[PDB]
A tleap script that builds the chain and sets N, CA, C and O, in Angstrom:
source leaprc.protein.ff14SB
mol = sequence {
  NALA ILE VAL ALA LEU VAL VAL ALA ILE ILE
  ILE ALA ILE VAL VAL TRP SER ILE CVAL
}
set mol.1.N position { 85.769 24.058 136.402 }
set mol.1.CA position { 85.227 22.641 136.575 }
set mol.1.C position { 84.208 22.886 135.671 }
set mol.1.O position { 84.025 23.971 135.121 }
set mol.2.N position { 83.264 21.470 135.445 }
set mol.2.CA position { 82.380 21.532 134.817 }
set mol.2.C position { 81.566 22.632 134.363 }
set mol.2.O position { 81.355 22.868 133.173 }
set mol.3.N position { 81.060 23.378 135.439 }
set mol.3.CA position { 80.281 24.436 135.171 }
set mol.3.C position { 81.057 25.298 134.435 }
set mol.3.O position { 80.798 25.536 133.255 }
set mol.4.N position { 82.078 25.837 135.080 }
set mol.4.CA position { 83.180 26.446 134.474 }
set mol.4.C position { 83.305 26.500 132.745 }
set mol.4.O position { 83.480 27.472 132.010 }
set mol.5.N position { 83.150 25.130 132.440 }
set mol.5.CA position { 83.294 24.852 131.220 }
set mol.5.C position { 82.329 24.669 130.085 }
set mol.5.O position { 82.505 24.365 128.905 }
set mol.6.N position { 81.226 24.953 130.810 }
set mol.6.CA position { 79.729 24.898 130.091 }
set mol.6.C position { 79.665 26.575 130.016 }
set mol.6.O position { 79.543 27.082 128.901 }
set mol.7.N position { 79.738 27.355 131.091 }
set mol.7.CA position { 79.780 28.591 130.814 }
set mol.7.C position { 80.414 29.217 129.622 }
set mol.7.O position { 79.940 29.865 128.689 }
set mol.8.N position { 81.723 28.806 129.944 }
set mol.8.CA position { 82.780 29.361 128.886 }
set mol.8.C position { 82.376 28.749 127.412 }
set mol.8.O position { 82.141 29.418 126.405 }
set mol.9.N position { 82.355 27.473 127.515 }
set mol.9.CA position { 81.869 26.670 126.454 }
set mol.9.C position { 80.971 27.309 125.609 }
set mol.9.O position { 81.178 27.812 124.505 }
set mol.10.N position { 79.801 27.217 126.353 }
set mol.10.CA position { 78.441 28.003 125.965 }
set mol.10.C position { 78.623 29.141 125.419 }
set mol.10.O position { 78.218 29.464 124.302 }
set mol.11.N position { 79.318 29.892 126.271 }
set mol.11.CA position { 79.725 31.433 125.731 }
set mol.11.C position { 80.274 31.336 124.458 }
set mol.11.O position { 79.799 31.818 123.430 }
set mol.12.N position { 81.126 30.796 124.554 }
set mol.12.CA position { 82.114 30.696 123.300 }
set mol.12.C position { 81.305 30.277 122.193 }
set mol.12.O position { 81.148 31.103 121.294 }
set mol.13.N position { 80.844 29.322 122.101 }
set mol.13.CA position { 80.203 28.457 121.130 }
set mol.13.C position { 78.769 29.480 120.971 }
set mol.13.O position { 78.474 29.800 119.820 }
set mol.14.N position { 78.203 29.807 121.705 }
set mol.14.CA position { 77.037 30.677 121.352 }
set mol.14.C position { 77.726 32.221 120.544 }
set mol.14.O position { 77.296 32.591 119.451 }
set mol.15.N position { 78.552 32.792 121.110 }
set mol.15.CA position { 79.290 33.821 120.590 }
set mol.15.C position { 79.735 33.526 118.997 }
set mol.15.O position { 79.453 33.957 117.879 }
set mol.16.N position { 80.429 32.728 119.481 }
set mol.16.CA position { 81.172 32.278 117.949 }
set mol.16.C position { 80.120 31.793 116.971 }
set mol.16.O position { 80.367 31.826 115.765 }
set mol.17.N position { 79.170 31.427 117.344 }
set mol.17.CA position { 78.175 31.045 116.577 }
set mol.17.C position { 77.257 31.999 115.838 }
set mol.17.O position { 76.670 31.868 114.764 }
set mol.18.N position { 77.297 33.013 116.727 }
set mol.18.CA position { 76.725 34.217 116.599 }
set mol.18.C position { 77.265 34.952 115.122 }
set mol.18.O position { 76.599 35.149 114.105 }
set mol.19.N position { 78.490 35.231 115.342 }
set mol.19.CA position { 79.560 35.729 114.355 }
set mol.19.C position { 81.204 35.600 114.730 }
set mol.19.O position { 82.052 36.001 113.933 }
savepdb mol mol.pdb
quit
């Protein structure tokens, strides 16, 4: 769901961003 995406999307983006 929208929440799931945000969680993962935010997790990935945030993570991927980190390194």
